[PDB]
Write a protein that binds this DNA or RNA. Structure first.
Length: 187
RNA sequence: CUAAGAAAUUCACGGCGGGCUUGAUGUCCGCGUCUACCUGGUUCACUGCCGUGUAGGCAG
């Protein structure tokens, strides 16, 4: 995508940057389900891979009209006193490219216990011997917190910036703005 | 290069029999505990779906 917009978290004593970036991510999720499409990307240039910290910035990549329409919508209403805006500008040249991949780990064996017991009609002890407790995976990835609306649960989405490439290919994005084959310019 | 250098304690055994500890008793007067703070600190790692799959993803 040719256009990027930077939003920076206004540093707040009342709330730490983790909650402000997660509620920005949640309202961006609501905005992207309200707008639809598969061609809206996100990126995080203040990523610190040593401490798995996302930083304070968010660069949303799309066209000019898409970002200009996303500025004048109520998905930022009630938030605009907690973040500073950029401007929709062209990506400079040249930049390396990378993806934004959500990596879900199977760190909870109870979901796998329920899955195997439901689809196979086995026993609890047969499933307990089938999968052990050592199937829990540990992630050193940055994460964000969101709240669900209809049936509610707070869950951490883990983001991974992939390896740097020289040329991106075609691909879509979710209603979350994460990579499904598409890439975002990294700068 | 050490008041260095060295060393086998050990065999066996019946402690028990008996007994009244008692009477008596006033704890007690008195007391200012106060003042002021965001339990959230991503830490609610969930719920379901596609997939034979535990391999891999998805949706909120």
């Amino acid at each position: 995508m040719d256009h990027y917009l930077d939003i920076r978290l206004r540093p707040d004593p009342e709330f730490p940057p983790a909650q402000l970036m997660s509620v920005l991510f949640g309202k961006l999720h609501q905005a992207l389900v309200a707008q639809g499409g598969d061609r809206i990307g996100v990126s995080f240039p203040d990523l610190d891979e040593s401490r798995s910290r996302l930083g304070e910035r968010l660069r949303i990549h799309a066209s000019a009209d898409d970002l200009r329409a996303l500025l004048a919508r109520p998905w930022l209403e009630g938030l605009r006193d907690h973040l500073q805006f950029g401007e929709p500008a062209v990506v400079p040249h040249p930049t390396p490219y990378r993806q934004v991949s959500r990596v879900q780990a199977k760190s909870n064996p109870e979901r796998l216990r329920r899955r195997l017991m439901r689809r196979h009609d086995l026993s609890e002890e047969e499933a307990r011997k089938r999968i052990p407790d050592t199937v829990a995976r540990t992630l050193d990835l940055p994460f964000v917190t969101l709240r669900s609306q209809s049936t509610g649960q707070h869950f951490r989405l883990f983001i991974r910036h992939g390896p740097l490439q020289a040329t991106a290919e075609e691909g879509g994005f979710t209603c979350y703005g994460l990579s499904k084959g598409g890439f975002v310019p990294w700068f």
